[PDB]
Amino acid sequence: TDPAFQNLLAEFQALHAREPALAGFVALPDSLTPQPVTPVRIPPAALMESDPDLTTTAYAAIRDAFIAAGAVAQWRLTYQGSRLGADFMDRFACYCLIGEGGPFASDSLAAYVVYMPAGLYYPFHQHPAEEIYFILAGEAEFLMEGHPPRRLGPGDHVFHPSGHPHATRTYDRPFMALVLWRGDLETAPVLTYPEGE
Ligand SMILES: [Fe+3]
């Protein structure tokens, strides 16, 4: 429906295809049932739209498209009643494209955008889905329990085994990423340390 979302999908489908780490993770079913989205705006959206420093190589289209459908997105508010403050809540940017709260439905995958501004810590978090982080724009640090950290640029990617604690920290750069889920799509991410860290 909303042509913002229309263009987005199409930018999704084509990158998926061009990118082995995506196409290797999940097959695109081709073949997604449309569903209405109730818009929710949050300040992070503003942030994403505004950020002058979401730099790329090969991934401007999708990026722009992510931005464009931002106006119509269901912005999420995961971590709501946690230990995380508005500091977090008003900076951490996420919406659904494929799945719950997104314009398209699927039993096989979900797809998302993550934005984070500079000077932010995304604390250690976890979920049942298997995960891929494909970076579109800027750069950030990726954290994963028991592995050395990785600085992630564009077209870089990280795999998250099930339940595996992972974190992100931005320094002076922002980033945007495509995030794909497979497996248990229904269980929302939770903080690994709801009281600490
Ligand atoms: Fe995750």
Side-chain angles (χ1 to χ4, degrees):
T1 45
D2 196 272
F5 292 130
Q6 288 199 9
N7 206 230
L8 187 51
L9 186 77
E11 294 295 348
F12 178 72
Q13 282 168 326
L15 169 76
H16 183 270
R18 343 187 274 266
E19 296 286 343
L22 315 183
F25 177 97
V26 75
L28 249 43
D30 231 291
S31 310
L32 306 138
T33 296
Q35 63 167 29
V37 165
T38 71
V40 170
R41 265 307 211 81
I42 77 179
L47 317 159
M48 195 174 81
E49 68 204 29
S50 212
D51 219 317
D53 193 39
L54 285 164
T55 280
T56 20
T57 47
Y59 311 104
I62 194 181
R63 183 253 267 158
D64 304 330
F66 274 125
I67 301 168
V72 279
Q74 194 184 325
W75 301 87
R76 313 148 102 236
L77 297 308
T78 322
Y79 307 117
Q80 240 186 350
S82 83
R83 89 185 165 70
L84 316 169
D87 77 297
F88 174 97
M89 297 299 307
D90 292 322
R91 300 196 286 151
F92 190 92
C94 202
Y95 79 78
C96 225
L97 154 94
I98 300 166
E100 165 92 322
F104 308 96
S106 203
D107 301 315
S108 77
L109 72 311
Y112 322 88
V113 62
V114 183
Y115 173 94
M116 292 171 50
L120 188 69
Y121 187 67
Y122 193 10
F124 275 116
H125 65 274
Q126 78 199 31
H127 45 71
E130 307 188 298
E131 171 189 76
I132 215 182
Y133 270 83
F134 190 110
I135 276 72
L136 321 153
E139 190 179 288
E141 169 194 277
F142 290 86
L143 304 184
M144 228 184 139
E145 163 175 318
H147 292 92
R150 325 185 29 210
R151 206 69 77 82
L152 295 190
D156 303 337
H157 57 87
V158 76
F159 175 85
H160 308 134
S162 268
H164 206 117
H166 46 287
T168 313
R169 163 164 275 118
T170 41
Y171 297 103
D172 60 316
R173 315 281 321 281
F175 81 98
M176 172 191 312
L178 168 72
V179 190
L180 300 183
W181 281 21
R182 68 187 198 175
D184 176 3
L185 312 173
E186 154 185 337
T187 309
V190 295
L191 295 157
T192 296
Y193 307 96
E195 301 186 35
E197 200 208 350

